[PDB]
Amino acid sequence: LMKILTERGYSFTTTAEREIVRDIKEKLCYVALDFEQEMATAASSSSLEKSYELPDGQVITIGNERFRCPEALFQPSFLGMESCGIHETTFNSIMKCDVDIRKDLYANTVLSGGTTMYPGIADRMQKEITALAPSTMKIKIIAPPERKYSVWIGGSILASLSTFQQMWISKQEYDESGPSIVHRKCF
């Protein structure tokens, strides 16, 4: 977002406007279903603008740019990104798993992490995984809007239970089996 506004000809290098665009990226964002269709609707005449006048005093919103901002993971050469595309990475990840467990593992695809900017990308992600998958495999994408605090609520579930203490390591076992065994006991 910083790069596209500064190459476009709009002044942005500053921390305060980075926080204002982070706030708008969390709240006002809306992301395309496809690469082709939303560029077609913006190409006929552009109108996808959700107008935001902030009480901070700044007026910054363009509806065309924000569905294109996370869309660059679909084709990385949009940004120039060194990292591999998402579709190919998922295909390779299923390829480097065991072949008999392949179908059962791909029947549970999960939303997680900082890519929770808007759940409009989740529909696009489900569409891309439907297009990836053949008829000889199953999909099942679980789609919670619990994707932001997901890391928190996991640990809050686990440590509450008393039967999970058998996989919680003590002082005694930490002295008997060394420091690094916390990597191995964790399961």
Partner 1 sequence: NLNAVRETMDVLLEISRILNTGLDMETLSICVRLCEQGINPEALSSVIKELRKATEALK
Partner 2 sequence: SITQLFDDLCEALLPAANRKRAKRSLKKVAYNALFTNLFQLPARNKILMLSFDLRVGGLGPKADRLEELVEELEAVGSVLDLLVQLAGSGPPRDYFLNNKHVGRNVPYSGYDCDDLSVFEMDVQSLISREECLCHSMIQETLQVMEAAPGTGLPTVGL
Judged by the rule CB under 8 A, the positions of this chain that interact with partner 1 are: 107-108, 138-141
Q: What minimum distance in Å lies between the beta carbon of 155 and partner 2? A: 12
Burial status of residue 121 (CB atoms within 10 A of its CB: 0-12, 13-18, 19 or more): buried
Cβ 30 vs Cβ 120: under 8 Å: yes
Q: What minimum distance in Å lies between the beta carbon of 181 and partner 2? A: 23
Enter the tokens of residue 114.
């900082």
Q: What minimum distance in Å lies between the beta carbon of 143 and partner 2? A: 6
Half-sphere exposure of 98 (CA within 13 A, CB side): 4
**160 is a site residue for partner 2 (CB under 8 A):** yes
Among 105, 161, 181, 182, binds partner 2 (CB under 8 A): 161
Interacting partner of 181 out of partner 2, partner 1, none (Cβ under 5 to 8 A depending on kind): none
Residues in 56-85 that interact with partner 2 by CB under 8 A: none
Nearer to partner 2, 36 or 187 (CB): 187
Beta-carbon contacts of 142 under 8 Å, excluding residues fewer than 6 positions away, are 108, 109, 110, 111
CA–CA gap between residue 144 and residue 153 (Å, rounded): 13
Interaction site with partner 2 (CB under 8 A): 142-145, 157, 160-161
